[model samples]
Target: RPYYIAIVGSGPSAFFAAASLLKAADTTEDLDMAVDMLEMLPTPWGLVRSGVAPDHPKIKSISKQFEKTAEDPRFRFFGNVVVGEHVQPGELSERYDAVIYAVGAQSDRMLNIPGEDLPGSIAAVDFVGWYNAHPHFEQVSPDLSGARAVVIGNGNVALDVARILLTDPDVLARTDIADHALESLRPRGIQEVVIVGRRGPLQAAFTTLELRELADLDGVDVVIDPAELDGITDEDAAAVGKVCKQNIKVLRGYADRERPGHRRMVFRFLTSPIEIKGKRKVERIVLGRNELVSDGSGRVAAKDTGEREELPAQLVVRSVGYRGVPTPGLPFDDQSGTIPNVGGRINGSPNEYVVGWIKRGPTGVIGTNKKDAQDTVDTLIKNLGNAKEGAECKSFDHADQVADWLAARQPKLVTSAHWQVIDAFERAAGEPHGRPRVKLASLAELLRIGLG
Candidate 1:
């Protein structure tokens, strides 16, 4: 049977899907065959280049595997491709035997409370994206010169955000922080960072590795209020166990430091963000502190203890999480925090699949996508019996317009090499300022700079 697969997004998931397809084409539940091309949106490297923490160069190392994908003769790079606007879902389904969506998550979910939309209440992921030069948020950055910042999530990302803000400006100068971001941050006298976890420290959604990194960063005082861990009964601690054990160890390190007047990293527990208060930006956060009670193996929220508090802050970055956008060609399920899928297959549809953070929501490290992409490709190949021949491949006719329009908008948007140019331009822009290039903070500005 004639077999060709079209992939969306060139990130780890998309490439992993292609690699899986190549391995699976010969063996299958259906008419197994090889993929001829793999397409990417505006750029490649997906979250590794965009969403991963900048300081951890190792996370981005997954690019080596992606380079392997690029070396494949069957794979093709279609930069600046978008699902709804440029390449419609229906069209690709018709043309290719399979179309895999590795588009990944686009935006951050807001707390939706009062004042969250204020100038300072920005998404932590967005802040990371700005430094990383992600296409969607190209050159976006907030004024981080504020003294106190609150990160509203208990996950690894929140920890990363806290560490960076409270991080010594001297240390950051040595890295590739966006020039404009460094400048905005350099002036900010950020003395404190609070990583607020909604659940008990035992149930924090952070990995041990991330927790360790926070404890080890140079200069910042990672504060873990031992008092926060006091209420957890030995029985509750035993049942909840390992996560608590780890948190306790990290918390001990924080307590052991016992240094004041230094940059402090505080991990707050059982607190939820109810309101963000500020006049122009985030000046304070109104928190409804909670106490945890057991449900089953996991947890369920009980009554609030009626304690409310506000912490002073000059800026606020919400590190809650990320979600996939509704592209033209895919079915998005908001409740699941992902595009609907069956074993990574697009729901009830043949030759359509999803992978990476978008497939499983914004979770896992960049390397995790290797397995994520393979799972999706396996499903896609399993369902390849109904391979269509470019008939419906471009079915979502309006889809291709998006990538093209964006590319047209930014004339230099054709290649990753161009992005390297942007990279170089940014570097040169930063060279004179003793910092990384100040990335313009908007799409239009990015295009103008890219085109110019």
Candidate 2:
């Protein structure tokens, strides 16, 4: 008899959890295990497929590793099935030995300022989805009609948004950017993009790779206010890792060298968006001057200096951060946007678990989920003794039962086999263009290909 574990959300965390759990259980000769991954969308690979920038095909290619993970015999993908709507969380825990929730942060954080809901303001994730062809944001029509645009954060997402705004359309067209988005990007009106950060260079959340790409934009010029680097001394660089060191070095190199390009990207530090000033659409943004001051604990944060400035821009996209929403029948911390758990066990719920961004707020890149999932799986394995032995239970084979159940309720349920078909279809379609794959942006198109 094998232990049955049901993992919700087929993202990187879910796949990594399945891999870790199976590998651990493989140690014992007689005992075996199986994992069933449930996803709301017909497609899998949560953020890696939807949130990742389309131009960075190399990064998105990490899904190949996930594909290999899914090939295990004990694995089953129940796609196109909503847990809260189709089967309640409590219902899932009863049939399986354990239920692990690995749903990543599905929503974006807001600037929490007036006029944030105005027409021009948008979330960076929404913008990324618009280009990546995420079904939820397929019809997102961002008005790239502005000459100057503002990105209000210094994280990798903010960098991605800025790079996409400045990158050559022909270059993006070569990737898997949605067809409609590619058309809109081809004739972009944004001339200058300003990425503002509330803190100094050392505090920037973007990695060296993202910064290097922005600095190396083909026909785009990278600009930085030389004063921003004045506070970042050699001593400060030594305090950080290679990533932060290289980022500072790159910014300095950009400021020293003179480049000729049509598009310009400006990096502003020690500044924060006080308000977005506009009527019908964004006219400009009001920013407050901030200074990094060390708190009593030796940690530092940006403190407002009462000075204010307005940068002329027609569009504003806030990339401050991401927050996971509460799913039905789960404990959630509204402030942290995470499930309340010690390690990975949901508080007061023995078998209910969580992983990925939902387990620990939005922090880290895709590969980070691997180790994060391992921690949760280790905890789950430790608590497995507490789980009711399903070997004698008649419903131990809930994975198959759920499949049979979903077959009737969700005729559109996408299987791993079906994803392969869609994958082949996408690759075959892209073979002619020298691109990776042309994603189907519409839900109808996805279901049409997934069903067949």
Candidate 3:
């Protein structure tokens, strides 16, 4: 008898865990195991399909690795099936020997300040999803009529949104950008895009490669305020680490430049938005100046200088970071935005686990899930023998029984074969246009194609 596992959320973490389980079972004692990956969307490759920018096709190509996992005989994909919504946790636990929740953080952290809920203010997460054809944000259209836009955050996502906004439409035209989003951006009047951070550039969250990309974009002037680095030196940056030193080098180079371009991308540090002022839409944002000071601990933190300034802008995108959403039955740490897991084991729940952003908070990139999943699988492998006898929990003798149950409850349930149909359709639709794939954004369209 095989050890049955139901992995919630068909993302990078789920696939990695599935791969690990299959290999571990074979290597350990020729133990039999079957992995069922569940996805809420009709499509596979969660963020690889939606969160990643379309212009960076190289990153999206990682799906080739996930594809191989799905092809394994011991693995099955159940798409368009929400675990908590479609099937209860207790029911899934009863049917399968274990359940691993791998759902990543699906929403962005809010600013929680004045005028954050204003019409013109939005989350960069929504905008990123809109451009990438995510169904949740498919209909989202931010007004780009304003000349200046402010993006608050210093992460890779903030840089990605800025790069997408400043990128030439011709370049994006050949990419797999959503048709509706591309149309919305073509006539975008935004002339200046500002990326702001509350802390010093050295403490910023974005990596070196992302920071360097600002200089490589066409028709966009990369501007850094030289005065922002008044007291900072190579010694200060080097003390922080290698990433900060490289970031300082990139920032200095941009500050030294005098080139003029059609569009401007400005990086502002040591600033915090206090108020977003407008009647109905975004007009301007009031910022408070900040300075870094050493706390009692070795770490440095930001403190406001009481100096306030206002920057005129039409739109605002908040990209602070991401947090996990609370599922119906799972124990979530509200403060940390992560499932309460001791290592990989779900706290207080036996034979249940979590991995990726849901287990920990949203931190690393895609490859990070591999090691994280392996850690969880290692724990699972260690405790397998003491678990229930396989004969007692054999609720569904075959995998098709679960699909049959899902089909009865939700008739539009999608399978891996259905995803292949949609995948081929998208590529064929984009073939004549010289793009990678014209995404199917609507649920109705996807279901129709999948069922057909």
Candidate 4:
């Protein structure tokens, strides 16, 4: 019997994993082995467009490599399909020789504070999704106009979110940001962006390049309190110990400008959100002062100083990075922010595998997924056994017929050709607005884009 593998999620890790499997030496262990590719999005790369800040075209360029993965003959793309929601995990076990889940961690980490759940409060991930035109958020948007946003966390994601909120629409027009989000953000009054971190500059998580980008955005004033860098030893300041030091470089520039009260991007270190206040819509946040103490492992931990302060803002976005949610059928590990598997192999189970953020936690850049995916494939190959005895795949003709079958039921579920039509519509739509055609903002628009 041939070994048949099914991979879910069409993002970088998923694509790379497939590439690995297709090229693996033992892939020919028997004539019965084959690989099938699946993606939840009709198009893949979980966050290539949505996760990368819109202002950074260079950052999102990795999409080119993912496109090549789709072109591989051994890979198949089952778009608009989801595991656990559209199909069950156990069914996959019963159907394929092996099941590789590269779903990636799609959920954002939470800031467990009282007002953190308020109406105007939002996840930086959600905001990024909105701007990128993710389908789940067509009806939603946190108002950025007249919005003063407080972004919590010090990772690169924090920098990305802040930059997006302050990006000029004209600047982002060249990038493929979703349409409805663009319109909503065009009216942004978010002149004040406070990026909050619990630790000092030497210990923060942001990289140097991202900090430099923020300081350089057009029409956006960047400011730092100067006090944020206080108490750092001369050695700590000079060596630029980590990428976080680029933040100081940016801060030094801002210090020269002495904006005092005018800045679109603000960096606040040694602080953490303690409470969110405001009802109906949030307008204020209570925060606590932070101090860092050596954690003994050579990393510093944020220690609360028992001091409190307040900042009034109409909107708030937490940039604390993403985490995993219990995907429908996978055995989940909440503690590690990932799925549990030994060497990417599903221990105690036959031929199951995992990859990317779902395998590890939500960390690393887009390129990082490549190595992660490759490793999982190595494990999967070691365990490649023949798939189930009776499960069937749709013939190529059946693949062609599914469109008709889908049309009869959903009327507007997207097909590859339908996606083409949608693209044509969006490109034409962008011309008259002095901006790119915004993505169809809602499910209804998507359906209409396909149906019409």
Candidate 5:
């Protein structure tokens, strides 16, 4: 009999865990494994499908690896199944031999300033999701009628939001960006974008590659203050390591270049938003000047200098960071926004585990989840001996019984075959337009097509 594992979430971490489990079964005698992946949405590939920028098609190619894992006969995908709503976590423990929660961070950290709930204010999380066709953020229609927009962060996500806002609509048309987003961006009157960072250039979180893309955009001027780069001494650049050094070099290149483009993207450093002020919508943003100070531990922190300035804008995208929300029954750390776990095993729940952003706080790139998932799978494998003893006492007698039980609860459940049908349909739809795929952004459309 195969040891059944139920993985809650169909993101990269979940796929990596599934792949590792299948590989482990090949070497371990008397251990045959079967994996069932449950996803809230009808489609699989969480961030890759909903968070990654459409302009970066190369990054989206990683989904092919997930496709390979899904092809294994021992694997199954259960889409459109909400864990806490349709099936409780406690019930999963009663059915499967083990359960792994790889649910990535689904919520964004807020700026928590006044007027944050204003109409023009949007989270970078929702904006990225809207452009990438995530159903939850389909209604996040950011106003592009204003002349200037402010993106509040220095990470790759902030850069992505800036690039998408300033990129030519015709250029974005070839990509798999949502049709609604493309239409909204086509007639945008916004001409200038300011990517505001709280700290100086040395402390910025953007990578050199993403920073360089801003400079390469046609008809878009990448503006940088030479004084910002001048303040970073040689010793400071070296101490920050290679990526920051490369980023500084890229920023110097932008600073030295001439601004001859119609559209402009200005890198505003040493500034933080104090409040977003507007009567009806976002009319302007108040920024507080910050200066870096040593924390007496060989580290630096931003300190307000009490100087304030205002930048006129209609749209404000808060890209500070991501945070994981608590699962209905899991042990979660409210401060860190993660599930409390020791090496991927939930501290108090036997046979329960976590991986990716939910295990560790939201950090690292897509490839980072690979090793994280492997580490969690290793812990699961080490405890499998004990797991088998518990499995003998599970309520369900057969692995198929779990599926029968889920089918009875979720009549609109999407199987792996159904996903393939939807996939093929999307590909065929995009073939004529030379796009990767025209994504279905509505829940009804995804369920109708995926279940049909």
Candidate 6:
């Protein structure tokens, strides 16, 4: 009999776990495995479909690897299935031989400053999802009529939001950005974007390649203060390692580049947003100057100085970081924003596990999940020998039984076949424009196209 495994979430981590499990089954003589993936939306490839920047089609193409995993006969996809509402984690543990939770971080960290709830202050997560055409963020309409915008954070996500805001509308039009976002950006009066960071250039979290893209944009000036790039000794650069050293070099290049374009992107280091100042909407932001200090542990930390400055801006996107939320029946660590686990195995739950951002904190790039998933699968494989004995075993004999049970519970359930129909339809619609699939940005449209 095949060991049925249920994987929650259809993101990179979930697909990676499925691939590892299938390979293990193929090589092991005594084990047979069947995998089921549950997704909250009608579509699979969770973040790849919604989190990746629309202009970075090359990164989005990683979904093709996920597509290959889905094509395996032992794999089945269940879309439009919410874990807590439709099928509880406890119930999944009862029905399947094992359950793996690969749900990536779904929430963004807040700035917790005054006037943060203002209309113009938005989270980078919502903005990215809105542009990528994630159905959940279709209603997020940020006003772009203002002349300047401020993005808070030094990570790649902050750069992404800044780049999207300043990139030529014609350039973005050719990509698969959401029609609504495209139309909103087409008439934008915003000309300058300031990316704010609390630390020095060496401490910035963005990768070297992402930093280079800003300088490469046509007709957009990338500006960096020469003073911000100053005072960094070779010892400091070596301590931060290669990426930071490479990032310092990139920032130096930006500082030397001439400004000839109407549109501008400015970088501000050693500044922290203290308050988002506005009446009914964002009008200006108050920032406190910060200084780098040795945090007793040899690592550097940002310390707020008494000096303050103000910048006029209408839009603010906080891309500080991502955090995982509590899953219904799973044990979670409030402090770390992750499921409490030891090497991917949940602390108090047997035959139940977690991987990806939820297993560790929200860190690493997309490819990092492959090694993470393999570690979890290895632990799961070792424990399979202690499978539930005779009378205690209640797992279904066939995968079809689980499908019928889920269908009965959710009549609107979307299968892999239904998703293929949606995919083909999207490709057909976008083919004439030389673009990738024009995404369906509403739940009703996705359900109608996939289910019908």
- Evaluate all candidate structures by whole-model CA lDDT and list the values in order: 0.68, 0.85, 0.86, 0.71, 0.89, 0.89
TM agreement with the true structure for every prediction: 0.84, 0.95, 0.96, 0.87, 0.97, 0.97
Off by over 4 Å in 3: 259-261, 388-396
Writing each residue's lDDT as its tens digit, candidate 6 over 1-452 gives 78889999999999999999999999988788899999999999988888888888898888999999999999999999989889899888988988999988888889999989999999998899899888889999899989999999999999989989988888888888898999999975789999999998888889999988887787689888788777865577768899988888888888886645479999999999999988899999999999999999977899998887888999999999888989998988897889998878998977899989999888888999999999999998777766543344444646777888899878898999999999998888787887787889999999999999
User: Global lDDT for candidate 2?
Assistant: 0.85
What TM-score does candidate 2 get on C-alpha atoms?
0.95
lDDT, model 3, position 330: 78
What's the TM for model 1?
0.84
Give residue 75's lDDT in candidate 6 (0 to 100).
94
Q: Give the TM-score of candidate 6.
A: 0.97
Clashing residue pairs found in predicted model 3? none
Residue pairs with colliding backbones in model 6 are none
For model 3, the local distance difference test gives 0.86
Count of steric clashes across candidates, in order? 33, 0, 0, 10, 0, 0
- Can you write out model 1's per-residue Cα lDDT over 1-452, one digit (the tens) per residue? 43667777777777777778766754544444434333333446676666665577665667777777566655556555455655478866766667778777778888888998898788976888776655455545676767788888888888778867866667677656655566766764787888887877667777777778776667677777668868656565557667667765666666666576567788888898888887777788988888767678566654478889988886778888887778765677877568888788878776677788787888876668877777776666545433333343323323344335445643445454554555576668766766444444455555555445
Model 2 Cα lDDT, one tens digit per residue, 331-397: 8899988999988889988788998999988989888988989999899887774443543333444
Please say which candidate is ahead in TM-score: 3 or 5. Answer: 5
After best superposition, candidate 4 residue 254: deviation in angstroms? Answer: 3.5
Deviation of model 4 at 290, angstroms? 0.9
Count steric clashes of candidate 3.
0
Once model 4 is optimally superposed onto the true structure by TM-score, how far is the C-alpha of residue 62 displaced, in angstroms?
2.5
Please say which candidate is ahead in TM-score: 4 or 5: 5
